[PDB]
Amino acid sequence: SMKIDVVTIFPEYLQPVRGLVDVAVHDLRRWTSVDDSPYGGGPGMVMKPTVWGDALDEICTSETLLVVPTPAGYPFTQETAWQWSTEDHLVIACGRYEGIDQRVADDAATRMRVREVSIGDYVLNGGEAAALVIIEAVLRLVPGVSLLEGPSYTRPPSWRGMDVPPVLLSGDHAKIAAWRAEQSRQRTIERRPDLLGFDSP
């Protein structure tokens, strides 16, 4: 059983989320201008801590795992997803602009567990798409719901003059298992050599 609360100034972006789990989306502006120029200078705007503090006060408890997407976060991995899959309560704080005043996470950490995470090494305009990814990766692991996958095939056995690998039609479990291992190994070496402890291209 899990409850997920998502806080965002763009609640409409979280629509694609639509009994063991409830997901609720909250408009941050309900607790109010949410942004201002950064202290110390720099381009863009920073979300003010005041509005966030009030929102999180209401939504979070000491048992909450507060998730804060950020391009500067610890990596969110499958291990993270497994870890979070047994939590009772995730709150995902989605910001925009140049980010959220750091004191929001710092203040929250005095009261609950806080995880600043990034879903990958690319830049988004805000946390919402990251929230969608995190929710999907976590929810599919909730109780009651290494190497790269090799290629998959289905009918027909010949299509546009391209044949399904004959071993897959042979019914030889051992040969099929071995061919699939080899395919995964070749794929991992080519595409993700880091997973096998080699240099990245």
Ligand X SMILES: N#Cc1c(N)n[nH]c1-c1ccc2c(Cl)cn(Cc3cccnc3)c2c1
Binding site for ligand X (CB under 6 A): 69-71, 73, 95-100, 118-120, 122-127, 130, 149
Token pair for 70: 């950020």
Opening angle at CA 5, ends 4 and 7, nearest 5: 145
What is the C-alpha to C-alpha distance for residues 146 and 194, in angstroms, rounded to an integer?
10
Token pair for 22: 């409830």
Distance in Å, CB of 72 to ligand X, minimum:
7
Residues 162-201 interacting with a copy of itself (rule: CB under 8 A): 162, 164, 167-169, 173, 176, 180, 187, 191-192
Of residues 4, 8, 15, the one with CA closest to residue 126: 8
Residue 45: contacted member of ligand X, a copy of itself, none (CB under 5 to 8 Å, by partner type): a copy of itself
Question: How far, CA to CA in Å, does 107 sit from each of 23, 56, 91, 113?
Answer: 24, 10, 15, 11
Is 166 among the annotated ligand-binding positions? Answer: no
Distance in Å, CB of 84 to ligand X, minimum:
14
Position 37 contacts a copy of itself (CB under 8 A): yes
Which of these segments, 24-32, 58-66, 85-93, 153-161, binds a copy of itself (CB under 8 A)?
A: 153-161
Position 70 contacts a copy of itself (CB under 8 A): yes
Rounded to 10 degrees, the C-alpha dihedral 159/165/166/171 comes to -110
- If phi > 0 it is left, if psi is from -120 to 50 it is alpha, else beta; for residue 162 that is beta
Question: How far, CA to CA in Å, does 169 sit from each of 15, 154, 160?
Answer: 42, 10, 18
Segment (H or E) for 5: strand 2-8
Number of neighbouring beta carbons within 10 Å of residue 120? 11
Residue 102: contacted member of a copy of itself, ligand X, none (CB under 5 to 8 Å, by partner type): a copy of itself
Residue 80: contacted member of a copy of itself, ligand X, none (CB under 5 to 8 Å, by partner type): a copy of itself
Residue 96: contacted member of ligand X, a copy of itself, none (CB under 5 to 8 Å, by partner type): ligand X
Q: Which residue shows structure tokens 């995730």? A: 90
Residues 72-111 interacting with a copy of itself (rule: CB under 8 A): 72-78, 80-81, 98-103, 106-107
Q: Closest residue to ligand X, Cβ-based?
A: 95
Which residue, 153 or 198, has its beta carbon nearer to a copy of itself? 153
Annotated binding-site members for S-adenosyl-L-methionine: 69, 95, 118-124
